[PDB]
Amino acid sequence: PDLCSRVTFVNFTVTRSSLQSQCLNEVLKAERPDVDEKRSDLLKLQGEFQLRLRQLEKSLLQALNEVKGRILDDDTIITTLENLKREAAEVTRKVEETDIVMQEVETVSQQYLPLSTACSSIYFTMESLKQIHFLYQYSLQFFLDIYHNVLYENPNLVTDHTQRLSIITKDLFQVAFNRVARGMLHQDHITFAMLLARIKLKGTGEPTYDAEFQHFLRGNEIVLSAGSTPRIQGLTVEQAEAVVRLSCLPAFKDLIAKVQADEQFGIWLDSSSPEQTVPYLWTPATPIGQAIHRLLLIQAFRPDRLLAMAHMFVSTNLGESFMSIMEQPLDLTHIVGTEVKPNTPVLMCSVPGYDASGHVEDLAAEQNTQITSIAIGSAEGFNQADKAINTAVKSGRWVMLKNVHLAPGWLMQLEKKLH
Amino acid sequence: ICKSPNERARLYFLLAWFHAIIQERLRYAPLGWSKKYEFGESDLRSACDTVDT
């Protein structure tokens, strides 16, 4: 607080509108270069013309302020009249580039507004993701690196902007999930994937399931009927309470009637593997809506298969092979050699009992690149680490530090020196 | 793996399957294994080395 009292705090944080504008400008530069450059030229022109109008107003007010005599008896009045006529002509001509700017902004809006909304949603889910496991904290430069991978490395690179936008969106979702979940635990992969599924659903001619998702997230925490015990014909007390809590949904109204009407449906909803075949029903329903209804039914009936049902929902929403690369082994060579800046250290956070030093040394043997592996924990080790870092920056070799988590008080200036 | 004799491939397959089973059994503790052992990469390397020897 002694330092807090003496200074005026100013935060340059990132907002939704600023992120949307930056991502829209980047998309314009990547896709429509001449259109983006003429747009920028027109904004610069509009700013210059507005400055000229302000100069006109100030000059006219100053000239009429200090005439020091009759207006009709001076020629300076005539000169100011001529200048005002010229500036009236240019403010009249301003309407043409105003209309051209209007055409430009409507075109870019109708072409790339949902993409920028997806940009904002994905990056702010990315920032809010840090509330789980304290370990991942993704910065804005990480998202910008994702965009430099998406827009500038287009697989199967087309020459059609309408389908190129959809290709960019799908590739963005896929590589965002790949790059984030490459550095998370396996328990949070499904959470991140279904958050991205929610973003994709929000970004699309599909009705929003706001009440459905609100009840899915806050169905157990909501208050249910007290003392109302349904039939225990084929459902336990917990399943009956879940059915009671679900029954307030308008789509699932006569669930109590339906479960006993489908008396033969004791296998499609109980035992076996219910994630594949789901009984009952939620008008032609969309496949995503059917997946949502099946997910709610699974959460009400068999909470064990909730992970499988969420995986199937993610598969139906973003593609069957959306998260089929996580179970593949980690191809670290291409990731290091292609998508890692030399100024960014490669963090390898490992659970106890499973190290990565063998992986790094195998990489060194494969690429035939020399490494000084230095074990952190002594003053001599710190000096050797600084010397090796300086030599590696000068020459171009790789430097490796092991058991890095034993000196945060040194990691602070290590990060500062790296920056 | 491809080094002679040809049965070394099947032996390594059996060893990999055994390692995978006894490593996946650690998730369902204490029903799989009574204690949370660490059947890491080092045990796999030692088993491969002794099979080769």
Binding site: F124, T125, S128, L129, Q131, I132, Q187, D188, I190, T191, M194, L195, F216, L217, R218, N220, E221, Q299, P303, D304, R305, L306, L307, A310 | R27, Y28
Partner: peptide
Amino acid sequence: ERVLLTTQGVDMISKMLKMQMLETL
């Protein structure tokens, strides 16, 4: 795997609920 899968689903729901939060004794 039933209890483990159930508690994993509960933890997933709690994690996304924490995500949606930003958006005398």
